[model samples]
Target: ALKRIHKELNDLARDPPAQCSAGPVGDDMFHWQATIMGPNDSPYQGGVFFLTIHFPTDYPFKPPKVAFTTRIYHPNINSNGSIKLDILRSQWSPALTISKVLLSICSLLCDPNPDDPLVPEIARIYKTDREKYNRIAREWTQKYAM
Candidate 1:
């Protein structure tokens, strides 16, 4: 598992993903810190969100634990920064890499899945009042993410 994780780290260094970066926190190869620059087309623009990632002892077989350390107001994400994304859970595959995962998260920021939200009240507002939801999201971005 360490060998595979090392290869992924080298791959990231070689061809870093756009608007996203990840690396080990310190001496621990299994724990990492990641940052995602909010997408320009989304309300999250101009903000930087941080995330913590922890690889289990049996990585590749089990998905890494990933959660936002920065606060983000989105229907698909809760106040605790827990994300309700299938790829990060039951749909995880060993074939996926952190770069790809971050890219997917970027896409999620651009287009959220409100139907399967982690925060239902936010989802309600998102579906009922698009502008209102966007305004709060932008506000939160400015307050917490910038």
Candidate 2:
């Protein structure tokens, strides 16, 4: 499954969308890695965030367990790498592929759904003080997770 995903990711990278970086971790096909450049004109700009992808034994039947290996100050992702994204949970379908998941994550980075935030305080800050929130998020990305 990882090999399949890896091949697909490589193919996508040949012609990737402008705002994301994704590939396998070294030679370990199963352990995939991704880094997303924060969206332009958004508070998340200048941030480069990383995530780890762990495929379940059942694979496509169940979506890979995705987590932020980097410490991002996001309302949706907790310090422990747990995320509150619906697609990572109940909304996943077998038809989804690695590129799709990575694309979704990149989109999530740009537009956070605070209504289902994992960290309410972070969500509040993101909603109320955009500059401060971006500052903290950029700081974390540089200090611990870049």
Candidate 3:
């Protein structure tokens, strides 16, 4: 499992998406840090969001615990950094790699799932007024995450 994780991390480093940045912290193999740029034209624009990934003792079979180190106002991401994404939850599979998980999270920033939201009010606004939502997200990013 460790070998697989290392390989995935190398692959991500070699070919990362435009909006995301990820790497290990020094020599810690199980703990990694990532910063994701907000999706283009979204409220999260110009925002660089960070997260910490904690790999479990039994990986591949069990998903890692991911938390936001940078705070932002999002429907699926709680103030405490607990996210409401299904892929990171019970729906996770061994076939999923760390790169895939981060990519999923980056996409989620652009399209939130309000049905299972961590912040209901934020979700409501996200579904109703997209422009306002983006403004607030950008504001929060500047005030908090930046």
Candidate 4:
């Protein structure tokens, strides 16, 4: 598992994903800090988002604990930085990488799954008031993510 993490680290450095970068914090290889530039086509654009990634003891089989460090207004993400994304939970696969996960998050910023949201009020607003939702999202992006 250590070797796999090293390989992933090397892969990330050799060919870092667009709009994202990640690395271990201090000497703790199992814990990492990552940043994602908000998707260009989304209301979240122009803001930068931070996330923490903690690899489990039985990684590869068990997905890492990834959560937001930056705040933003989104239906699938709650105030506590919990994200309601399938790939991070029940649908996770050993084949997945941090790069893919960040990309998925960027896509989520672009298109949120309101029906399966973590914040029900935000989801309701998103479903019923598109303009208001985007407006508040942008406001939050400016306030907390910039």
- Give the whole-model CA lDDT for all candidates, comma-separated: 0.90, 0.76, 0.83, 0.88
Report the Cα lDDT for residue 71, model 4.
94
Number of clashing pairs per prediction, in order:
0, 0, 1, 0
What lDDT tens digits, residue by residue, belong to model 4 across residues 20-111? Answer: 99989997889999999988767788999999999988888888888999998999888989888888889999898888888888888877
How many clashes in candidate 2? 0
- Evaluate model 3: give its TM-score: 0.89
Model 1, 118: alpha-carbon shift in Å?
0.8
Give the CA lDDT, 0 to 100, for residue 98 in model 2. Answer: 72
lDDT of 2 by residue, 42-128 (tens): 555666777787777677778888887777778988989887788878999877777788788878876787777889999999899
Per-residue CA lDDT of model 1 for 38-115, tens digit only, reads: 999678999999999899899889888889999999988888888888988899999988888888887888688888
User: Which wins on lDDT, candidate 1 or candidate 4?
Assistant: 1
Candidates 3 and 4, the one with greater lDDT? 4
TM of each candidate vs. truth = 0.97, 0.80, 0.89, 0.96
Q: Which lDDT tens digits does candidate 3 get at residues 1-146? A: 68877888888878877867777788788888888887767667777889999888789889978888888888999989888888888899988888788888988887788877899999898889878887888899778765
Residue 52 error for model 4, in Å?
A: 0.4
lDDT of 4 at 49: 94
Task: In model 4, state the lDDT of residue 34.
Answer: 92
What is the lDDT ranking, best to worst? Answer: 1, 4, 3, 2
Please list the residue runs of candidate 4 whose C-alpha ends up more than 4 Å from where it truly belongs after superposition: none
